[PDB]
Amino acid sequence: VPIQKVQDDTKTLIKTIVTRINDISHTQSVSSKQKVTGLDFIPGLHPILTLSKMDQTLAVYQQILTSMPSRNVIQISNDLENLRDLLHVLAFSKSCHLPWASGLETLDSLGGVLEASGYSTEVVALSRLQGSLQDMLWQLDLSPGC
Amino acid sequence: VPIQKVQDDTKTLIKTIVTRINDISHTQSVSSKQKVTGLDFIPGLHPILTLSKMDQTLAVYQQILTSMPSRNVIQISNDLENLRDLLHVLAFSKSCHLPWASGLETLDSLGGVLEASGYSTEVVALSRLQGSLQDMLWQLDLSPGC
Amino acid sequence: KPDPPLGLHMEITDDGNLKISWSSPPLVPFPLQYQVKYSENSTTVIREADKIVSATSLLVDSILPGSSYEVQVRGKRLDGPGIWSDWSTPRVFTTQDVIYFPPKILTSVGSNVSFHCIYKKENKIVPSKEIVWWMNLAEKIPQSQYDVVSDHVSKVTFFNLNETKPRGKFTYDAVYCCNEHECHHRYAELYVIDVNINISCETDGYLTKMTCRWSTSTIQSLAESTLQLRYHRSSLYCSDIPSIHPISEPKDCYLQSDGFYECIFQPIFLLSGYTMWIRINHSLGSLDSPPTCVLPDSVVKPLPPSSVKAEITINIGLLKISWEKPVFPENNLQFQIRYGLSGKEVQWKMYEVYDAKSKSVSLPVPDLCAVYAVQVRCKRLDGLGYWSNWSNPAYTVVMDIKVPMRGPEFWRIINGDTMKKEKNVTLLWKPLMKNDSLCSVQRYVINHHTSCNGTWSEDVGNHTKFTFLWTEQAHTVTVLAINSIGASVANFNLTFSWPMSKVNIVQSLSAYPLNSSCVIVSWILSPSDYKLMYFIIEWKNLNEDGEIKWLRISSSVKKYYIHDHFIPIEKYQFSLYPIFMEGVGKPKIINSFTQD
Amino acid sequence: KPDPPLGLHMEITDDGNLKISWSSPPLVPFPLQYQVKYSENSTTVIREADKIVSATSLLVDSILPGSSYEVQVRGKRLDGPGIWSDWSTPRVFTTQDVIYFPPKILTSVGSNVSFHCIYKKENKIVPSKEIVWWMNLAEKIPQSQYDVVSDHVSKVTFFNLNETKPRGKFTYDAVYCCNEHECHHRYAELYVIDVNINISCETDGYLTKMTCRWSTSTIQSLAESTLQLRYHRSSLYCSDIPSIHPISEPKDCYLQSDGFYECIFQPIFLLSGYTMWIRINHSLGSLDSPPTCVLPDSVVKPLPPSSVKAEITINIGLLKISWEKPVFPENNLQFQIRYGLSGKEVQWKMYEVYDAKSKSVSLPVPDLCAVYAVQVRCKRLDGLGYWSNWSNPAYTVVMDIKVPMRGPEFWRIINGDTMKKEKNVTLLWKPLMKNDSLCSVQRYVINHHTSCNGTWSEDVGNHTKFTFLWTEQAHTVTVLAINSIGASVANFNLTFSWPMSKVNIVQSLSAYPLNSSCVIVSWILSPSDYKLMYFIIEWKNLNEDGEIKWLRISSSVKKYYIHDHFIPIEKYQFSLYPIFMEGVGKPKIINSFTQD
User: Coordinates of motif WSXWS motif in the sequence (chains C, D)?
Assistant: First the structure.
């Protein structure tokens, strides 16, 4: 496993997902940092300094994207899976043992927000994902640690 | 309601029906004035000087055309209905009260001729209709009265 | 004792009222009076209320958010000493914190719509001054639109609405009511659908059926929408202002490959007014598109004029066009005639005829002997109608239309030893070109004129060469062209005269090759008492047995450019003949290009 | 008591062993032990054998040709004091005289295969030395390949196998084992199928789907063959050596009009490795084509660069090209730009840009005022990927890019009676040609220079002729061309001076027509104290009111070929003007060609 290629690949997966979200016109107009009530459980922009938190973030994002019926987001879910697996292999190349993050045990609540107000949930979740990805790419040179 | 348009329209409906009958090849070869036994009840060429007689003539024609299964004649029945309604509105524009003519009460007999000999009944009824329409158009300038 | 009321349901009205409803038991053939017991359990106040109602429903004003409604109903015979039923099973309905009124609005483009909202924060109703509205989470709505109806409730008013543009799956625009900067997940749905649907109809040329079409393109955005054309038939003509009628009937319409719906009216009422509109039966509500009225007689597409004939009138030379008016309509019509030269692409000239009793028109044409394509179409003379399709092209047949305009240009060969009084003169001409022949030349006739034998004529048929014996002192010859109408009007003559053959007026003659395609021939004239009409230049190769080439040139000309293949190595003879009324003069001849 | 075993069948293994098989009765929920009774009846020896087996099958080693096998089976409960079933019905199987082992081989190109055979002649096994092998009855196989494993059996070994070419209906090659010259009807079937099937994939420019294709052309020879693409998805990237994985899934592939199969992967995992292979499920056996691994990111076909703009930079004159990188991939890219003159066929020049942060490039072009077509395509800068399609052509708009390079060449007409001190001078020029105008000339301005009035300028607009009054002893005129940037850099001047008009330096002048398209004009110069810059030759027809034609010629020139239409019969005037710094000198004039 080439180490240099994996960091560059990490960059590439992040940029691809960011562009995917860019294609989604409604998400672009929505403020990433801005707080919307009810969605607080989704891990939005809060400093993601280390590998275990980023991994759990991607796990939660995977759980959110799976539940919402949209074609673009699903293949994107595919991109997120490759990104997570890539993060695990990089964590291995640094001699770190990353336990496979489970998603949130507390999903019995996310269903409610999706039924009552779908629009807020999708636009917020995607825009915060885009923000988180930018921070991920930013931090990927800082020599991330486990 | 434009009076000039209604007289011209009366002319147009008559000419259209006349042409319709012209398309029916078997009717053209048959003498309009010629008498055929059994059909005498149909109001054939006998001078139609006034509006109430013409209206009753169209009513009888409507009853005859409805009973015979043929596609051309039926839409033509449609033309006859517009002609009758038009005659009623013109009779109104002259301050005449035209009572809605009922058809012949004595239709219990027309059925017999249609079953026993259909060909004679259709060709005669249509050719006499065509003749009556020509007389109608002729009289429409004579200042018809009620 | 009636059975307890069944089917107890609770719905929220657009006004925000709680409508409790139930069904009467199906087995009572008499009206029931109901007693409704309900409790409203909020976090701070319990209210119980018993209401007696004769209707199968009750409104409870202003549903309180974050409250629980328990409901029971019992029935009794309305008339007489009826026994009460037992109570219905209690039904609980738990409400949400945030109210929009209305929750949804379905409108058309250009309308005005307004919403009211209440925002609950920890079991408290906030003041309206705090409430701010947002659109699609993208941007804040301008403050000018907001109106404070009361302290608790805020309202937004929209004017001159534009069609909602769909973003992905969502057909509607999400409107939010927020307490300052922070918003909540729940939003209001705004559905604006373009009801401006164009329905166009066309009556067939036989007046046997009526065809109507309409497009889906504005409505492909709403899944679950069903579309139904409705129509109302008038007794006569269309109203000045079309409107929706309560009594309407549906029409079976079929989606075509081009994406348009087709509705067929068969048989037809020529003079009945058809009012049409589209019924959009959304899951909540029915919307009617703007109604339009169509008169079948005013939307007739006539058949093209039949039996179109194009002939050029004999002797006159006009393109005479005729046709037969299509059966419908029999009303006065105007006609449009396009005509042009027949080719891969026809340059159509237009002509319009407004005479109703006109069946044929005659139009001057520049070439009488070419095939013209001609198509005719018609429309109602008053303009109230559509244009018919263009008729099937008619083509002219080339026939002679006049006698030939001009007789052929001819020259002579003289075969004769200088010692004989008699010489064979072979006249030679080319067939007339189309402009001079017009259409055809059937035969050539040679008129001879002499002092002794007078005038006679010799028929040469379709031959382009003729040889006669020249014996007399003066012999004038004229070639006529004859077609089926007669002989050519303007004919060339040539007088052959023996005294004059000594007269020489051409002082010098020179020929200079400009290139392999052009030689200049130039000459100088001496003064002459005879009135020269024109010259003929003759040239031939002397190295080949080439045909003697010749050309007629005006007497006003003193220099000519002969365009022909001239080989500078070969010896060409150039003969310039001066031509006078008395005949062809003595030629000046040169046998070489002038090298000087 | 179990039911007797059912379905007793007998098949020959590729090794030539007799496999007797049966089904257990379906109603026993416990294992059975079986007893098989069989007899083998050959022409010379009878053998009976009873075998007890726990399996539902028995192998009998080396089936004897021309023998009859009778078989019966009975079952008993394996565990405990079970009762035996009755015996099965006896089954007879009669064998043939000649054995091939194996009877058939299915292999791929480049493999090694070997067959063994036994040939029976009148109930006797022949020695292997006698056996000879033949191919398709056409020819004997070389002796070197044969190997004698034992006295009774012979073997052939094939190496570096090539694809079997089909002869008519038969897909396989027939291999024969013969006793010397004479062969037998029965043969062995050899099936070699090209498993070398190329599967190519392409990711769409939006990274929304993955397209895979493969050809049928090598496999149209086998009827009854079914083809199934199988794939295995890796978690990340492709392995260095692709291999068949036991856990695989099929893919729905559809045959296209071009004869290729299409397999669509939708939605996509940008970084998952797709291993593909073709499963060929022949009636006897499954073969897997060589597996290939494809990385979707490395097989992306990017979209062409969008928003391509081609403009020529004002003042600078470079073809500046710009574009926008296509969204994918966002990785560094290299670009290829083709540019050429716009026409029916564009001579494309190539240029490559490897700077990732480059969005626009400026390339010198020879003609600034022509329309160039320009197309751009992109590829991953590291080379790991495909080239995008060429962008939609961009075209330049002709705009002025510099001031005109050169002012127009001009001459003068002098209209004036010799007795007047004042003369009208009409200057005449032609519009600048594209190379001198570059793109456009908006206006001409005439700069006048005199000893008394100094310098002034007169705007002539777009006129090509101007008339001024010449009054002074010396008047210099200069014509400037002006565009939207400014005036022409290099301009012609002409000084009109009255003293100098008497100076004559042209001793002789002669003109000789070479042809109707060329006249030589030659002149001899006298020595002169004035520095001659150039000549202007002027010629006109004297027989026609022809426009005065003129041309500027270097002073170094002593003979010139004028290419124009010259009629040797017409009188031409040729005027040679010597031009000095002080102005136009006295012309030498000739009015005829020199005949000497």
Answer: 387-391
Resolution for this PDB entry, in angstroms: 5.6
Interchain CB contact of C273 with B (< 8 Å):
no
C444, C407 Cβ separation under 8 angstroms: no
Name the nearest CA neighbour of D115 among D141, D87, D78, D76: D141
Q: For residue B87, give its domain range.
A: 3-139
Tell me if the bond preceding D4 is cis, omega within 30° of 0.
Answer: no
Name the token pair of B4: 């000039």
Q: Is A79 on the interface with D (CB under 8 A)?
A: yes
Q: Which residues of D touch A78 (CB under 8 A)?
A: 267-270, 272
Q: How far is A86 from chain C (nearest CA, A)?
A: 31
Q: Which member of A15, A78, A89 has the closest CB to residue D267?
A: A78
Phi, psi values for residue D316, rounded to 5°: -90, -40
Give the containing element (helix H, strand E) for B88. Answer: helix B71-93
Chain centroid to CA C559: how far?
56
CA of D568 vs chain C CAs: smallest distance (Å)? 8
Query: What is the Cα–Cα distance from D181 to D134, expressed in whole angstroms?
Result: 10
In this structure, what token pair is assigned to residue B88? 């009623």
Residue pairs between chains A and D whose CB atoms are closer than 8 Å: 49
Distance (Å) from the C-alpha of residue D456 to the closest C-alpha of chain C? Answer: 49
Distance from C-alpha of D560 to C-alpha of C555, rounded to nearest angstrom: 39
Longest CA–CA span in chain B (Å) reads: 47
To the nearest whole angstrom, how far is the Cα of D515 from the nearest Cα of chain C? 7
* Cα–Cα distance measured from residue D208 to residue A72, given in angstroms and rounded to the nearest whole number: 8
Interface test with D, best of A85, A88, A93, A133 (most D CBs within 10 A): A85
Residues A55 and A81: their CA atoms lie apart, in Å, by 10
Q: Is the omega angle on the peptide bond into residue C587 within 30 degrees of 0, that is, cis? A: no
Helix (H) or strand (E) holding A75: helix A71-93
- Contacting chains of A (3 CB pairs or more, <8 Å) are C, D
Distance of alpha carbon B85 from the chain centroid: 13
Which of the following CATH numbers is that of domain C410-497: 1.20.1250.20, 3.40.50.2300, 2.40.128.110, 2.60.40.10? 2.60.40.10
Phi, psi (deg, nearest 5) at residue D110:
90, 0
Question: In sequence order, which residues have a C-beta less than 8 Å from that of residue C122 and are 6 or more positions away?
Answer: none
Buried b (16+ CB within 10 A) or exposed e, D27-57: eeeeebbbbbbbbbbeeeeeeeeeeeeeebe
Q: What letter represents residue C185's amino acid?
A: H
Q: Is D515 on the interface with C (CB under 8 A)?
A: yes
How many angstroms separate the Cα of A89 from the Cα of each of A14, A101, D121? 16, 14, 69
- Choose the CATH number for C199-299 among 2.60.40.10, 3.40.630.30, 2.40.30.20, 3.40.50.720: 2.60.40.10
In what side-by-side order are the strands of the sheet with D318-324? D306-312, D318-324, D360-364
Architecture of the domain spanning C99-192: Sandwich (2.60)
Superfamily of segment(s) D500-590: Immunoglobulins (2.60.40.10)
Which residue on chain D is closest to A22 by alpha carbon? D327
Query: Which helix (H) or strand (E) is B75 found in, with range?
Result: helix B71-93
- Give Cα C210 distance to the centre of its chain: 21
- The rounded distance, in Å, linking the Cα atoms of D129 and D139 is 19
For residue B85, the SS3 value is: helix
- Do the beta carbons of residue C66 and residue C97 sit within 8 Å? yes
**Interface contact B13-C330, CB threshold 8 A:** no
CA distance D220 to chain C (A): 38
CB spacing of A29 vs C186 below 8 angstroms? no
Neighbours of chain D (3+ CB pairs under 8 A): A, C
Residue B22 lies in a domain: yes
Chains in contact with C, where contact requires at least 3 CB pairs less than 8 Å apart: A, B, D
